[PDB]
């Protein structure tokens, strides 16, 4: 038994004309979502966005869609992102590292997107049900039989 399912990671960034009072030059938004017409809430319990230490309360949790964070800042950084599953066995979660980069003056706003495919070996029937409700496919080996004589 094998279940394959997909996730989307992305972010948008925009250069401000006039910086904020804190000197922030960009407004940005980072998100986790499913492919077109796939509600990952079926199998995702929560998403934790680990912002840089310079933000207040940088451990940002989304327990329900939209799974996203909207902020303002002056510099890009690598953002660890944890997608937690509605699963009582391991794996309980999956960890990504996302490059939240900002655009230079003269380049268009950022609209970056990533597609990630998760593969689970023999998930519990309850969890595999949730994955198949969100665009997954289940694959099960069977006994093969040849079509010709020898």
């Amino acid at each position: 038994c094998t279940v394959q399912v997909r996730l989307e990671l992305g972010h948008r960034a925009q250069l401000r004309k006039k910086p904020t009072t804190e000197g922030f030059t960009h407004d940005w938004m980072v998100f986790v979502r499913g492919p077109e017409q796939c509600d990952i809430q079926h199998f995702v319990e929560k998403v934790v966005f680990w912002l840089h230490d310079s933000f207040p309360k940088p451990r940002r949790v989304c327990k329900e869609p939209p799974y996203k964070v909207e902020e303002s800042g002056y510099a890009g950084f690598i953002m660890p992102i944890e997608v937690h599953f509605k699963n009582k066995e391991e794996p309980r979660k999956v960890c990504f590292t996302y490059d939240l980069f900002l655009n230079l003056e003269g380049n268009p706003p950022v609209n970056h997107l990533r597609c990630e495919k998760l593969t689970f070996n023999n998930p519990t029937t309850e969890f595999r049900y949730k994955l198949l409700r969100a665009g997954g496919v289940m694959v099960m080996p069977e006994g093969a039989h040849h079509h010709h004589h020898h």
Binding site: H52, D53, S54, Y74, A75, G76, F77, I78, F101, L102, N103, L104
Partner: peptide, 6 residues
């Protein structure tokens, strides 16, 4: 651009 680190 400038970046931040951990």
């Amino acid at each position: 651009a400038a970046r931040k680190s951990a």
